[PDB]
Amino acid sequence: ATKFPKFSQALAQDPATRRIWYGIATAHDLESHDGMTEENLYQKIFASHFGHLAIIFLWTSGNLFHVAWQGNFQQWVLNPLKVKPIAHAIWDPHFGQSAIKAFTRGGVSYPVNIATSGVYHWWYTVGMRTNEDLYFGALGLLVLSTTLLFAGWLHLQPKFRPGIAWFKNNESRLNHHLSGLFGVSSLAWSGHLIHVAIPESRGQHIRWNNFTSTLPHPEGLTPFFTGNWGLYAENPDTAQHIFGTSEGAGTAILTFLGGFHPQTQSMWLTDIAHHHLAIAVVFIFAGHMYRTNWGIGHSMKEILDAHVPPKGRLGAGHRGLFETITDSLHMQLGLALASLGVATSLVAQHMYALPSYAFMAKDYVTQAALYTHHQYIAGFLMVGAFAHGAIFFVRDYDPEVNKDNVLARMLQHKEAIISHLSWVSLFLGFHTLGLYIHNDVCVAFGTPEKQILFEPVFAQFIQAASGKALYGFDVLLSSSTSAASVASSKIWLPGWMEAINSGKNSLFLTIGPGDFLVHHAIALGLHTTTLILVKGALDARGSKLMPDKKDFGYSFPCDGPGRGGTCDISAWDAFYLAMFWMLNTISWVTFYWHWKHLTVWGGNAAAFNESSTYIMGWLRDYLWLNSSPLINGYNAFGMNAQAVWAWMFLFGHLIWATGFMFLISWRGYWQELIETLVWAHERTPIANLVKWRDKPVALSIVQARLVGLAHFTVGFIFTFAPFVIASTTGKFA
């Protein structure tokens, strides 16, 4: 009715404060709202997609506008290695005088924040040189956000709402996505690179007024049409190019030298355009696959129904998977989040391994922040994929449709899967903790020579097979006169070998026993998080303790204290438990990356190689040592520009600590406390005339777990980000 949860009649009649909390918390759960049909659900999701896309482009336009208005892009272009990039200007009426002088840094004269997101290098590579270019990009993205908001409004109109058959058109949507949204966009980016970014790297000034009359190549469409495509690769940029200017430059637009530009320590811009062109052609061909309207093409139902091994090896094969995926939005979303989590972990690895933006791998602060950023986001997406698979099992899985399916057999032998994940996790934890404690006791007792240090020969063999030639394995690419080393010897090999065998890059960092131990720790974390998530997903439909768990839904508090006790029995509680393990393993990964790069950037990799084998070495050489510039941001003798990072460090500590409130103390204590406070307010004079509308009650059990988990996570992020930024900023190496 007129009450706030208009979508839930059950919540609107709640006389307590639980109504507001649950109405806020269940606003986006479009499947369970009152009187919801499938078509209306799909239309609302389409409109929400448009609104979210507009939010993304508004955020990017805001970044562009703030760098254009309050930034030092003009000064940073002229000297990228010595000028600090600027995020935006600071307005604070709470500042003292010394805070105003302390935050006044860079070339500007106002208090200011130094950008650690690397947007300066990215825009500098793609041809931005002035503040007007950034402002025009901000205007374009503002107009795009306006257009997307209008489109979202338009597709909820009665004559423009698409039908349910339009949404479930898998072949047409995948054809158009794979061809257009991937290949045509990659082709357009290759065109932008060749027309603007490559000439800007060579000193030419190409903008909207002269791009249509300036030839990107001296010949121009003659090597392409005649078939002499190798003319575009001749005369590349020499190894004296000096980015942004024209001395030692070339006239090539599509090359595959491989390796790094010698000055910017990033990949060649002509390699990237060639890469994008190849990906464009491949994606257009791949989008030419599924039957839409012209006879040719596949049917996705027939491919899935055909793939049955001959004699019952996988049951009934993939029969019925087409009907389950199309009719369940939770399975599609789970597949999307799993793939996106793999993708953003891949970008996290490859942007430090193979930097593409000019004059990165020398800032080190953007280099740390981007990696930690993308790894934490990867962990979040990975947990969400399994959470939505559990939701799909709870309220979207049809057992009769999936009879003897490849999906039902997963539930058939779920006990074997959970038990073997248990065995792997227990084995890894036992052994890597035993090795770490052994090294701790051996170093503590004055005998570091008694440590168990396993040399990581498999990954070192992989590095040698990629071309690294200090391990002395002499195999494949590391050994000349080999088939792999000869076949590519005149396309991309010399640049790759001169980039992999130098000590200034992050390509295939030299690894020792500490790398072995911490990789085993990472495998432990991955296997245990997978254990919790897979067990929750597979036991979401029921177990021995609760055979009818599907009747109670995905998220419910418990099943009472009977038959032993049923605390944390739902699949939502399995998500809640696996969130801690994801945070733990991402913290392990980021600690390993940050300490290894802190020792490599300072030219002191021996410190990591000697102190990473035992836990006290970590504790006293990474965390205790690198906190000194952070915690000294403000003290009894004054303050500097890292005072905000010290304050945020303590802030994240306090939020992480007050999560333990909701995680350890449970409802009953607080409900009785609330009842005493209710008596207090009702029975005091003057103040009893002020009467509440909603009866105050304690937070519910699932709500309390969510609030404590959100506190734990926010405190986790807000205590790791200031450390990983200020410790790198406080050392410059």
């Binding site: 609104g51 007007e132 402002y135 901000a138 205007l139 908001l149 979202g152 409004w153 909820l156």
Partner: peptide, 30 residues
Amino acid sequence: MITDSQIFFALCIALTAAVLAIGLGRQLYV
């Protein structure tokens, strides 16, 4: 250097985007 007229033009575009955002949010409605 970004002039004041350019900033006010960007503010006008953002205001139009705000009115359309209100329209979309009230088309999904509560």
